[PDB]
Design a protein around this ligand. Structure first.
Ligand SMILES: NC(=O)c1ccc[n+]([C@@H]2O[C@H](COP(=O)([O-])OP(=O)(O)OC[C@H]3O[C@@H](n4cnc5c(N)ncnc54)[C@H](OP(=O)(O)O)[C@@H]3O)[C@@H](O)[C@H]2O)c1
Ligand SMILES: NC(=O)c1ccc[n+]([C@@H]2O[C@H](COP(=O)([O-])OP(=O)(O)OC[C@H]3O[C@@H](n4cnc5c(N)ncnc54)[C@H](OP(=O)(O)O)[C@@H]3O)[C@@H](O)[C@H]2O)c1
Ligand SMILES: Nc1nc(N)c(NC(=O)Nc2ccc(C(=O)N[C@@H](CCc3nnn[nH]3)C(=O)O)cc2)c(=O)[nH]1
Ligand SMILES: Nc1nc(N)c(NC(=O)Nc2ccc(C(=O)N[C@@H](CCc3nnn[nH]3)C(=O)O)cc2)c(=O)[nH]1
Lengths: 286, 286
């Protein structure tokens, strides 16, 4: 059986570090506090939960997080006006738009996200930030929070990444595609799979490192895992309880390290958002 | 043995269609013509060679191509002046900076590259354009010219890309990394290899599609190629004569299709730049 990677516990460590960092930065600079804005469109249930988990994490740490909930009937132009105000508000060190936008109207997500000024783009979702990470300019961009969390879980095994074959299953903007970029510039040999991949099972079996972000509940079977592999499960799936994208019970039999769901990637996602907001708060001072 | 993908003959088809496309624009909109500008730093022999190749092709087509050559001793502040002038020059539709800069002063390539207006970045080197491509927003960006030209070559086989396993060897900003993105959003399963990649012979042996962009003369041996593979060699290596990054003889015995070196990717890169130039000039009329 595989050692469980304890995200709920690993993240506690990070949030305690960040809180101390924020208190130092308030003693060192009086009246100053990191400020975060989360913009939501519509009223999705799951967006409400993740937004509010982020609100909690910002409160435990010392970050000032504001939440703006727009109606499902809002227009693209209305959303831009908010982005516009946030860009120029020199007190806001970072904001994000929780995705997907739940509007009855037709709104260009890419247009909205790309209007975020890259210095405040703590979610790493602008083309600008994505283009730097996609070309290995890793020390001047914000890296998407879920991939940041995943790398950290990988490093906690002690297993060096360089030279290992990583499989990433999923190519989403927020997770799968930046996760491939992060592993590549960490000198893994990376294979990216998706819904047109044939013989997925055999591709998954080459993975020394395996990151699954498909949103298909327990679709990746344990037999597919390479014996001794590091498995990272980004799935959060609500079924008849919460399951990940990997059939956890059989995968823990062949993995050497595995992430449970819940309590794995998800808390680490939240923590890395907090880290990026402290970083952009610092970068403002300097 | 393998059909040869003839870069000479294929690039000549596209240039002529570009040419007649230009001629009809000039009849439709009297006086107008597409203008390209190439900026060079230093006096590298090879960059002189390739820039002149682009000048000749633009001449055949009806693209007015200016070449500006700055000395090795120029400062980053000097290059910045010229880039800003090209950005602001309304009769220039696209311009590129031939890489790598050749300078005694240590000049920040990424600072220089990213000042180019993205609407004129016909080489697809701005971070804005790298991130649109890396995330699948393929309708608003200039794809880099060499990957464009491998993609055109692979399409000449008539064998669909979706579903096949593609192995990209190399992760450079100009070829390797953007080739992965192109193949990925044409729905291949893509493995990207580099120098910390172990057992390259075996990662290669997975390629239904194999693109090699190492600059390591004939380092991919023919014996590693999967039988029936489509082989694309981006190499140009001067040795005891020009050779590619693949062992051509043995590889030809196993591939279904293969690019000769020279006469393969090289003329396709030039033709793609001209196609990108004509497209940015079209977008300017409107
Ligand atoms: N976004 C959120 O709010 C959120 C929150 C918590 C957890 N997550 C988790 O994060 C992960 C991904 O984020 P997302 O929801 O933004 O992604 P998404 O848009 O739902 O895309 C899922 C990815 O998985 C691929 N996929 C679907 N079925 C597949 C199959 N049978 N075989 C292989 N690949 C398949 C899709 O491939 P194609 O590209 O070919 O369609 C796609 O690239 C999921 O595990 C999800 O549960 C997301
Ligand atoms: N750039 C030009 O003007 C030009 C002109 C003519 C032809 N070309 C050809 O086009 C390609 C372009 O290369 P570039 O100059 O753009 O980039 P580059 O800086 O030469 O990088 C070459 C890439 O190949 C990888 N590589 C090197 N040795 C390797 C090995 N033994 N095993 C696996 N991977 C290895 C390197 O991996 P790391 O990232 O780990 O180093 C790197 O990513 C080359 O094939 C070159 O001959 C380029
Ligand atoms: N812009 C933008 N848009 C997005 N959609 C995202 N993604 C995102 O926010 N993901 C996300 C995933 C997990 C969790 C979390 O807290 N997981 C806990 C408890 C789960 C649980 N479920 N039921 N009870 N508990 C656990 O997995 O352990 C929080 C947020 C983004 O990052 N940026
Ligand atoms: N910004 C920027 N910077 C860059 N460095 C590049 N790269 C680039 O331009 N590469 C390049 C390589 C080959 C050729 C070509 O024409 N090849 C012919 C003849 C070659 C030959 N002639 N004599 N010996 N070999 C052939 O190989 O058949 C054309 C362009 C870029 O695209 N953009």
């Amino acid at each position: 059986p595989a050692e469980i990677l304890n995200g709920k516990e690993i993240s506690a460590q990070i949030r305690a570090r960040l809180k101390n960092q924020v208190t130092q930065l308030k003693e060192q600079v009086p009246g100053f506090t990191p400020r975060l804005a989360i913009l939501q469109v519509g009223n999705r249930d799951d967006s409400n939960l993740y937004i509010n988990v982020k609100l909690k994490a910002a409160e435990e740490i010392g970050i000032k997080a504001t939440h703006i909930k727009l109606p499902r009937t809002t227009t693209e132009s209305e959303v831009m006006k908010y982005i516009t105000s946030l860009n120029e508000d020199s007190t806001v060190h970072g904001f994000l738009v929780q995705l997907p936008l739940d509007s009855e109207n037709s709104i260009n997500t890419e247009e909205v996200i790309n209007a975020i000024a890259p210095e405040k783009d703590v979610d790493g979702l602008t083309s600008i930030n994505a283009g730097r990470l996609a070309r290995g300019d890793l020390n001047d961009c914000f890296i998407p929070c879920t991939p940041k969390g995943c790398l950290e879980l990988i490093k906690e095994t002690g297993v060096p990444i360089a030279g290992r074959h990583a499989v990433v299953v999923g190519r989403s903007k927020i997770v799968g595609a930046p996760m491939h970029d992060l592993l590549l510039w960490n000198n893994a040999t990376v294979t990216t799979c998706h819904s047109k991949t044939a013989h997925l099972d055999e591709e998954v079996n080459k993975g020394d490192i395996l990151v699954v972000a498909t949103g298909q509940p327990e679709m990746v079977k344990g037999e597919w895992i390479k014996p001794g592999a590091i498995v990272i499960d980004c799935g959060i799936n609500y079924v008849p309880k919460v399951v990940g994208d990997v059939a956890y019970d059989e995968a823990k039999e062949r993995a050497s390290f595995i992430t449970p769901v819940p309590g794995g990637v998800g808390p680490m996602t939240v923590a890395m958002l907090m880290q990026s907001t402290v970083e952009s708060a610092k970068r403002f001072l300097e």
